[PDB]
Amino acid sequence: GTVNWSVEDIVKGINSNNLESQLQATQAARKLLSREKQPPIDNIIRAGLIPKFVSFLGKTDCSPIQFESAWALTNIASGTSEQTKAVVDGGAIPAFISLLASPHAHISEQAVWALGNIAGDGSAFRDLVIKHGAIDPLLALLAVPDLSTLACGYLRNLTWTLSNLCRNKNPAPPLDAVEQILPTLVRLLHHNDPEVLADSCWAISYLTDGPNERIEMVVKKGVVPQLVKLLGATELPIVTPALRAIGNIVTGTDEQTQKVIDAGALAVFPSLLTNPKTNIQKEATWTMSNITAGRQDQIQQVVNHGLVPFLVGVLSKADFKTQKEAAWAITNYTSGGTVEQIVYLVHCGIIEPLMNLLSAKDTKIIQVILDAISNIFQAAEKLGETEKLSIMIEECGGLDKIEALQRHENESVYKASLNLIEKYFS
């Protein structure tokens, strides 16, 4: 019927003055654009078909051509920024927003999907979709007493499109648009479906990726306990965005961080800091570094939850990017912690893995480590035991590495290293 038409034939059918001929040509275009190996998006665009598709979105009496043109345009809009731009340039945004009210769920859903691709291009099209008024009819689709009565695929598409309206920076989404979306997001964050949860978490992770007032908007909605619960999920597609959101939240104020600690997040980090997925380990350690940058009572809760040995472990053996995050966690800890907290750190075995990382070809981690060593030496001086620490550092090979760094081509490196040798090894 409509499989493997030529673009020439699609054009001839869409140019006929016969709505049913147009419908069949539009379906043929949809099937072309729905094949996976290199759909001819640019050939369709060049044939001038986008404005016809867009005008078909308004044909209320031929709902199949609304559906077929919506799908065709969705797949064009899923392409490069230039292809998405051709869809927007054809007037598609207000036509899709009008389609959100279609009595045919499959057509409404297709408009949701299209708007998600357009908004997902970037900040400017995201904000243009918002200016045309997409948010109110999108949210109205979710204004039911129990989300479980909506079709699963429909709900997943709505969640994904809403997460694209929360996404991207420079600029972040408008504050009022965020406030309007957030209660529906909180509700989706409690829905039982794994993909709805994953995409809800992604949305929250976008919204918390920014200055403290943005984080506060999210935290004051009370979602942190639910984020921590999802941090413990078995599905990696959920843990990844949930951990990202928690990490973002702990880049804020110590009071925001404290919400994360009070919700029980620290009890999941034994698993996270040993997780077989390298990126989970890395982002868990990043999160820990922004918790050891906090107050001494927060550092103390890291101690009480037994996480210091887990930081020793990721410093000892992990992917290098994780090890560097662990170096940051350690210097933050040593810079902010009490003397007894730093003593405890050393008794957990931090010194040797810290020293072994002075062999690394990355001058930034070397600076971080040297700074940590100075902080620890300062605790030792406050205890009159700089010498025992000097011995400990030498007996594990650390001094060789430090003086090797005296002749390092980076400046603050050899300055800090030299300083250390003058002050502590003579």
């Binding site: 654009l33 729905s34 759909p39 799908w71 809009a77 899923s78 691709n117 997902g120 996404r167």
Partner: peptide, 6 residues
Amino acid sequence: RKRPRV
């Protein structure tokens, strides 16, 4: 970020 319907 973007996804086609297949």
